[PDB]
Symmetry: C3
Subunit: 252 residues, 3 copies
């Protein structure tokens, strides 16, 4: 029973679709609570190996909500902090983005590991116009993704960036025609969910390390996890499969 | 009144123009000082919401006065803290725009990278040719260029002295936008006007949030952004921008 | 020295390391690791070298770490050996290094090209990190250096699906310095290394070190580091001659 999102299970893949189409999938408290509860639930399920978050063909998400007062009221509630539950998900996540990914919507797309964007996708941080700052990690994930000159530009002017520019700048994984987004997301998700669940979780964690410490510490952390792969059924099977020219049979 | 620069005020936008055309706006101690003095004064002016730095159509700034460095000892360099004054530019809280035409080489490329937004004419040529004269970047290029375009390309430019055109700079992350050379200055005004018409406060907080992404872990940067986000619901200006949007009218910050 | 898995040539101020395991697509075993590091290290120590190129064949730069070596590794073997640690000797090399990448550079092959300073690629180049699906994850720095080079969404894409990236995407994403036609790769790399090896030795070493800094600390720190390094340059003879020469409209004669 979710009011603003739909949740579907398809083999080892779970899909969260933002289901508030009238508001152009605007993000609010409730959306935040539901999206985060469903992903956490899918993370805990051993029969799931990839999570998709998507919106409509018109809008991944058009922004935050505007009706949604003190500083203490914001400090005490930790307004937006719950979004952090999306980043704490261990199972790989995939943002399938069509049309408007603006404000929070752009920031949600950025919280996922992999970002497959439609033909029609448009990204932006236009809340400077309302005299509002990003509160979902936009000034943080945007800059690390596309670099300073473009990050500043988008954040201070509110201009949009289309799919092609997001692809050449480092914002997206790959671009696909709009009609094919959901099938390309699912096929991508499917491929990842068929990997060893341990290896996929390890690989994702090692990559995330790239923004949390110096290169020397990241290199060390990666090398250590890599040695740990060797204590697993799946490293042995995966490599045995290569040498015996056969499909690998993972029990994750 | 300045010797190597011109300064112009038009509405809420400031424009610093390098004025050594004979020398292609090559940077020297005097230029460094003036730009910093002008930048700082525009930043302190409450009727200023954005600053432009530009040169001429031929060169933003191509190289530096090498005579001022030829006979420097380590001791003179360390004592003068040679180049440190340029840090005053990065410490400016108001958004800065580099409008780069033609050559932005050595110091000039480093000067462009210090600004927040980088608007390039299709004529812009970027490069760090220092290596040739037996030195390395001295004004943050090894740090800013690498962060903008990645190790592979930054190693290439700094170790060979090769130039990179406006288009390669756009795809690799160095510039915000490329515009035709003839539109360069007008386009910088347009972008500066837009920025200068934002809440001065919000625009400064946003710039400060962005700059944090180069100074700590994502984890830390996220927390800093959230705290500062909450602080902008305090402030009058967020009521006006909000009412403006509901009433489909322009905000009067 | 005398090597099994690599070839080593020196010409004027440029040394070239060519990977030589063609029966296994230059797959990287411990033998290759040790030989590449020892060669690079001893070239770095030679005063008559100014640049080092690492390359493979037209068909594969390297198609990974050697899987047969890894298949029969136990956790104890890997932890005891600190498996892969030794590649760090290459990153410690002071002379500028150039990766010249034709064909496959996947897994440790991609990782190896990423350890170099400059990456010149053939139009024919194919990058990837398909370790996932062997039941592992990059063990030679790919999750770190790839992400940093090309950004999260693309590094996550490659590392979790193990898809390949062609030279043109690599070039536009920040992974390589330049692409050239495959036939010109070796000619080009060699021209690049000539230019670098003719520069001042100290300047090129300082500059390489300063760039590397930019991944190791915050920006404030790197900036202070670069500037201090810049000031030391004023004690170098090559600064003097490099600047003297420029002023006199002549070519520098580095002693
Ligand atoms: C690159 C590749 C696609 C092209 O292969 P190909 O053209 O079909 O050629 P082959 O597989 O015959 O080519 C190579 C052979 O060289 C060996 N080889 C290739 N890559 C190897 C590797 N990484 N480790 C050990 N041997 C390797 C093969 O085992 C085979 O040897 P064999 O003849 O003695 O059995 C393929 O060899 C491959 O993908 N290998 C593994 C890549 C990988 O997963 N890398 C890193 C993640 S852990």
């Amino acid at each position: 029973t979710y009011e603003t999102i739909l949740v579907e299970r398809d083999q080892r893949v779970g899909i969260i679709t933002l289901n508030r189409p009238q508001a152009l999938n605007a993000l609010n408290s409730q959306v935040m609570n539901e999206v985060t509860s469903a992903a956490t639930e899918l993370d805990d399920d051993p029969d799931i190996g990839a999570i998709i978050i998507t919106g409509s063909a018109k809008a991944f998400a058009a922004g935050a909500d505007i009706k949604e007062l003190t500083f203490a009221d914001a400090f005490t509630a930790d307004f937006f902090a719950t979004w952090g539950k999306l980043a704490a998900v261990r199972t790989p996540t995939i943002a399938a983005v069509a049309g408007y990914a603006l404000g929070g919507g752009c920031e949600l797309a950025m919280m996922c590991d992999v970002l497959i964007a439609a033909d029609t996708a448009k990204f932006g941080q236009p809340e400077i116009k309302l005299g509002v700052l990003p509160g979902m990690g936009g000034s943080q994930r945007l800059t690390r993704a596309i670099g300073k000159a473009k990050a500043m530009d988008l954040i201070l002017t509110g201009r949009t960036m289309d799919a092609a520019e997001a692809e050449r700048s480092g914002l997206v994984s790959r671009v696909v025609p709009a009609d094919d987004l959901l099938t390309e997301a699912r096929a991508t998700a499917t491929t990842i969910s068929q990997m060893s669940a341990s290896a996929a979780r390890m690989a994702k964690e090692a990559v995330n390390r790239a923004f949390e410490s110096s290169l020397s510490e990241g290199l060390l952390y990666e090398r250590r996890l890599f040695h740990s792969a060797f204590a697993t059924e799946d490293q042995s099977e995966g490599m045995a499969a290569f040498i015996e020219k056969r499909a690998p049979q993972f029990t994750h």
